[PDB]
Amino acid sequence: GYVGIKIRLTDVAPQAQELFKKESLDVKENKVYLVAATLRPETMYGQTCCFVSPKIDYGVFDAGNGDYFITTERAFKNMSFERGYYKPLFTINGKTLIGSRIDAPYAVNKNLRVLPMETVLATKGTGVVTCVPSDSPDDFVTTRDLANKPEYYGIEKDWVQTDIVPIVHTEKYGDKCAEFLVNDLKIQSPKDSVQLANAKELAYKEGFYNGTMLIGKYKGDKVEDAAPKVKQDLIDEGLAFVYNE
């Protein structure tokens, strides 16, 4: 299914502090992670934030050994099966997390934050979405929408990094395939679901089968060869795990 990426919450947004303190959860001693599903572990170098949804109430679940996972009930269920209902420690709306600072595995970009995405599926994945605007058309379009409507989304405009670091070279779409595809397909909105599904498949196929890594341990290797190795490295290093639905 997916790789679940453990994105560490390092500094919680002010609006969330009372909550975390009320529940005796300290993000500096305890390891509290947002668990974001991805199909493309090799793109984790290019994370520029992570996305949660204000439309979702997340559970905070005790995963064991000092680790806590922030995700939907449904996804936590699926992780544990690998009870029928798992009670969280507490629940938290995505809006409450916005602006929190995070450490995302392998990301070269610094000072990452939790940002909103209005199209994140609750019924698919974990409710938390990795953000790699160089290579994910959805991510590129949401990033552009955030920068254009910061008041709507409840963010600082300068939280959106619009200066993208290339991580995969393709001959067909350049070094930032998502930018190329979104401009060339004239995709206007995060809500353009069918168009974005098409762009995503194009990006994934060209990137995976014809891409070359520009960064990390496997720099210069084909994505096709690198990606399972990046996956295994993340898993061995405790930064990720496999998530099936």
Please enumerate in sequence order all residues whose Cβ is within 8 A of that of 56, keeping only pairs 6 or more positions apart, or say none. Answer: 72, 93, 94, 120, 122, 127
How far is the C-alpha of 208 from the C-alpha of 42, rounded, in Å? Answer: 9
Task: Single out the residue of 118, 113, 116, 92 nearest to residue 10, CA to CA.
Answer: 113
Element (H, E) at 169: strand 168-169
Domains in the chain: boundaries = 1-245
The experimental technique used to determine this model is X-ray
**b/e 62-92 (16+ beta carbons within 10 angstroms → b):** ebeeeebbbbbbebbbbbeeeeeeeebeeeb
DSSP string for 206-242 = HHHHH-EE-SSTTTTSBHHHHHHHHHHHHHHTTSEEE
Cβ atoms 109, 161 nearer than 8 A: yes
How far is the C-alpha of 193 from the C-alpha of 198, rounded, in Å? Answer: 9
How far is the C-alpha of 102 from the C-alpha of 213, rounded, in Å? Answer: 24
Strands 212-213 and 168-169: antiparallel
Task: Single out the residue of 37, 110, 41 nearest to residue 70, CA to CA.
Answer: 37
Strands (E), 25-103: 31-38, 49-52, 57-64, 67-71, 90-93, 101-103
Cβ atoms 16, 97 nearer than 8 A: yes
Cβ atoms 241, 235 nearer than 8 A: yes
Using alpha carbons only, give the angle 53, 54, 60 rounded to the nearest 5 degrees.
75
Coil, helix or strand for 93? strand
Resolution value in angstroms: 1.8
CATH superfamily entry for domain 1-245: Valyl/Leucyl/Isoleucyl-tRNA synthetase, editing domain (3.90.740.10)
220 CA to centre of own chain:
24
Q: Is the dihedral of CA 28, 51, 116, 173 positive or negative?
A: positive
Coil, helix or strand for 187? coil
State the Rg of the chain over Cα.
17
How far is the C-alpha of 66 from the C-alpha of 104, rounded, in Å? Answer: 18
